[PDB]
Amino acid sequence: GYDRALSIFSPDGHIFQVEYALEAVKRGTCAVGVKGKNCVVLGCERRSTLKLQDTRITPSKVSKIDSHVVLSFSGLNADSRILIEKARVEAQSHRLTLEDPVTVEYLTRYVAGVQQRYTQSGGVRPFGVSTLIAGFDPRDDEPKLYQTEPSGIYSSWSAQTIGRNSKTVREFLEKNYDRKEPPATVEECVKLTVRSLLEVVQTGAKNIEITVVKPDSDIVALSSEEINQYVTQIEQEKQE
Amino acid sequence: QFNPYGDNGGTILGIAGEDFAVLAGDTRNITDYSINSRYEPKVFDCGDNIVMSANGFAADGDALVKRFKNSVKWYHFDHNDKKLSINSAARNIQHLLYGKRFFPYYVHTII
Amino acid sequence: TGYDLSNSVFSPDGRNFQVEYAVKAVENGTTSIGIKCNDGVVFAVEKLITSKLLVPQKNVKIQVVDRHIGCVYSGLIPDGRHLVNRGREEAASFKKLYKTPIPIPAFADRLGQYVQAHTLYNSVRPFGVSTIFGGVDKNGAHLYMLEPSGSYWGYKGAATGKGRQSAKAELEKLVDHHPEGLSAREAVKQAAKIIYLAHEDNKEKDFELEISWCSLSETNGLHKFVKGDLLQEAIDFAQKEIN
């Protein structure tokens, strides 16, 4: 078998293949995650260079791992499918052996472990993908939002963004998001998520995707018209 | 058909005192109605102030004792010449025996 | 260019430079010889005394294969040991299947093919030793010498190492002056002399002499080391000739 060490250290103590995998994430479309008091919202960018697309059948950016957990990403699209599949398998495997669905932290730890394994295995390159994993633990009303990256490190976030122009939207969230009092309702949380994407997206038409996840496996994806109403309200308030 | 087990007879006895312990065993070794030896040692000093005997099928008995003595040696190498306590030795012997659960050492062991 | 960086690569000449570089390691090593006699063979080697702290007669260089074959080599000592280990496996499987001890020509090819195999791939390095070996079999006495390339021939006399030219010259004289042949006990004496004469190329450090022999009459066709009085007799003969 092909055993070649592709991910290796350099004189300055860097693993370039892992760092170049982050550059692939930087190229990817923007993804954002914001958690409220009783909800989490995942926002995603759709680049409008691709028109004449069939939006019914085109792979959606936000993927369900289980009925209570979701995964969005920035980076290579093909790579993301492999992580999602492995995660979905592990989710069912956990239910089978532990007789309880995965916690969001556990599912994140697994996905992050897979990414890490690909940074010190022979004959493989790292995943060019960073993920945002969000949801609610079984029988728990506390919102969860985690991030992973090609190196394999993971951590929890009150709010976070990844992908192209993520530096700008992270700047926005850092001043607008208050820890002492987060978005109390679903509306407030979605509004803040759409606002943060409007700093980068360009047009607020079919370029913004929103997915709301609530406790007890209550996940729903917003339509074009529903999102367009948020876009209208934000700009009308801005004209002042 | 080949029978991989045999019976070498003999009998062993362990008694625990207040600040001492004894492990006794007869020195006779047999097959069927014949005597093989009138003096064949059966109780062994295994180091770390532990004595052991594995009575029944002598070939398995010798193999087990030999492997436990070996385990004591490697316990010293791997853990900075630490003394193997009697309780730790007992647990180690369980794993030696259960390791051959589906082709057992045909012996009754006492330490 | 770049043809010499990887093993098993033909240069535009048709040469394998890696094998030629392995020869340089052989040429760097101590002198070792082999002498074919009437009913057997004699092996001898130069052991450089690097320090007084070396225990005399302990660091043995000559190795036995089976009970009838002797092996000596010059160059990287560990590579020679690896080759002898293989030779011992080859001889064992031959005797296992065919009952009779391995003939010397048969044994020579077993080593030859194994050394040659280490010139076929870039994943392995060629052997850094030239091995002189031989013994007595059903067809009589045989002496061989095997190079890093896997090339080997039969020899009347053989020599390798740093003092090979000096040795080769001395061996050529014996072949000319003794066409009817040389005896086993004579060959031991001559072997001692040739090592002493070949020591002029390694004249900085003093050395220790080591000799072995297989002979149909003197050793019943078995490999044995030359020890005690017979060794001292050969040293005295060698010391007398240089003076």
């Binding site: 078998g1 092909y2 | - | 994943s123």
Partner: protein, 250 residues
Amino acid sequence: MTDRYSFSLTTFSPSGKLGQIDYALTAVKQGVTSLGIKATNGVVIATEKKSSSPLAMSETLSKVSLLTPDIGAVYSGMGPDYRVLVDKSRKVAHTSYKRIYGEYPPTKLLVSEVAKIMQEATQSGGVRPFGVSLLIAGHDEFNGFSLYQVDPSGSYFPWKATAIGKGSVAAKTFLEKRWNDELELEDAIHIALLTLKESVEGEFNGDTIELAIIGDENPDLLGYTGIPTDKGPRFRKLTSQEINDRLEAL
């Protein structure tokens, strides 16, 4: 030891070229000219027996090879590569078809299997592509007569007539003028000999030319009688004498 070349030796260059395949095609270009022509009632394949030495017996070296009783092959490029491909082609016709369906494969499917083998040498670890282009002529019940070309990439195309190797550019032009859809087998053989004479320098006769046909069934070449449904091989290699007879009426 171990084969530690588990990586591809053929890779895409910045321009999108697969270098080793292009270089393999260059090796085919240097090779001796061979051609194939399809008629209404048969197919003909031909090439020059470029003898490396006059002491060498050119009869022992067969450039035109039987793959199945109804399928033949000829090449241009590296002869040794062709020889092993013919061995593998003959075997795969049995293992992947005849041992399953109890009958020989149709021309297009055998070509597909040969093509697969050549593709794998273009992508698998530690190997170079085959340095040959094949012309495979054959017949089967449901597809009739057919002629296929197979390149180092593994790509294959069906032809009415074509040529490969040294003087293929000129030979293909010559065939375009002469070919029509109403050719009989003898007419195709005649055209094949005319086309091949242009690319040959030295001697031009039955001993220096190798030519075979896919035509009518040959019950005389079967080797046994008693089974009506077995009527014999459609592949036949023309003899030295049979070639010379047609060179007189040339």
